[PDB]
């Protein structure tokens, strides 16, 4: 009633599926298309699938089953994504670690998650003497097999990945959460099979999912950035032109540091900070579709998306399809439109909660007295203060 704002109604984005289903569909439908480009090395979707499958079978032999958590720590490049996909194909969920993660934090996170192990490279294996958990190398997980190993299937209720944010706090995202997010957001972004997608985010960040898994969803080609390029905005601008990139997921401060426009960019998805007006004016051109995505990690990558246009005020926009937002008071009561309260998010992509933290989970994932379907019974309290304006639009106002 103007005080509960919903994204478009799209029940077809909820399927009886897991991430392995989405990727396998793409690889079997487009075997010979290039999936991954690292420098001058390229891997096809079919190649990627068979290699990741061999790795997943090795994980199975070593005891990885659906519902397990496997840590991921490798340098940016093909092997890193390959290993992510191998964990996924084994039916386990992955716990991603940035290149710059200290070994002690790795140990704290693997312990907190009760992970059965982690994947890393021969080189980095020695940095992990402090890690008591099992460490596998991608290399050993890539050796030939004598007889095939049958992979147990995971289910939508099972975790797809665990994101840590610091006492470390692990956020459990389910297969259902992430598969729905991918379909819901791509229905608006519309990444296409012909697209060439820059892959610059560390796997430890939400926007890596928009770079990688949206592409996997439609069979786009990923160009994987080296560590040295990620901190060189002018060189990156020239790289994006020379590599004929069409899709940039990035943060506003990075876009602002580009000297020239990059004409070949179909889609520009800015997340993290609300895009400033000067940047919109500089970039919200006709040959660019410039977007602003907002959302906590606790509701799978993004919860709202906004089309940016020169001269139009910037807001977080409307919820994604099947997402919903409302505002509540200090005692969890729905507020009339226009008042200021805590922004709450609901829908099929609300995370399962905080790993091993029933306390904080119950504090922040509460029952929704106002759910109009079984996919709306869980409200996540963002902690942000917000108001719903006279146009059904949510306005952020800072923390509570
Ligand atoms: N979700 C990220 C920033 C927003 C990304 C939106 N595509 C975070 O919570 O740190």
Residue numbers in the entry: 8 to 173, 178 to 411
From the paper:
Here, we report a δ-poly-L-ornithine synthetase from Acinetobacter baumannii, which we name PosA. Nonribosomal peptide synthetase (NRPS) enzymes, usually composed of condensation, adenylation, and thiolation domains, are involved in peptide natural product biosynthesis to produce antibiotics and siderophores. Activity analyses show that the A. baumannii homolog activates L-Orn and the full-length protein produces isopeptide polymers in vitro. Structures of the isolated adenylation domain from PosA are presented with several diamino acids and biochemical assays identify important substrate binding residues.
To better understand the substrate binding in PosA, we solved four structures of the isolated adenylation domain. The α-amino groups of all three substrates, L-ornithine, D-ornithine, and L-lysine, interact with of Asp217 in co-crystal structures. Glu221 showed charged interaction with terminal δ-amine of ornithine substrates or the ε-amino group of lysine indicating an important role in binding. Density for both ornithine isomers was unambiguous; the electron density for the lysine ligand was less complete for the carboxylate and amine, suggesting the longer substrate may adopt multiple conformations in the active site of the crystallized protein. The adenylation domain showed modest activity with L-lysine and a reproducible low level of activity with L-arginine and L-histidine. Michaelis-Menton kinetics showed a preference in the apparent kcat/KM of over 160-fold for L-ornithine compared with L-lysine. As Met218 shows 3.9 Å hydrophobic interaction with Cδ of L-ornithine, it may play an important role in the specificity of substrates, since CHPAs adenylation domains activating Lys have an alanine and PDAP synthetase has a phenylalanine residue at the respective position of Met218 in PosA. However, the apparent kcat/KM increased nearly 10-fold for L-Lys for the M218A mutant. Structural modeling of M218A mutation showed an increased volume of cavity in the substrate binding pocket supporting the role of methionine as a steric hindrance for substrates longer than ornithine. The assays showed no peptide peak on SP cation exchange chromatography nor the presence of lysine polymers with LC/MS.
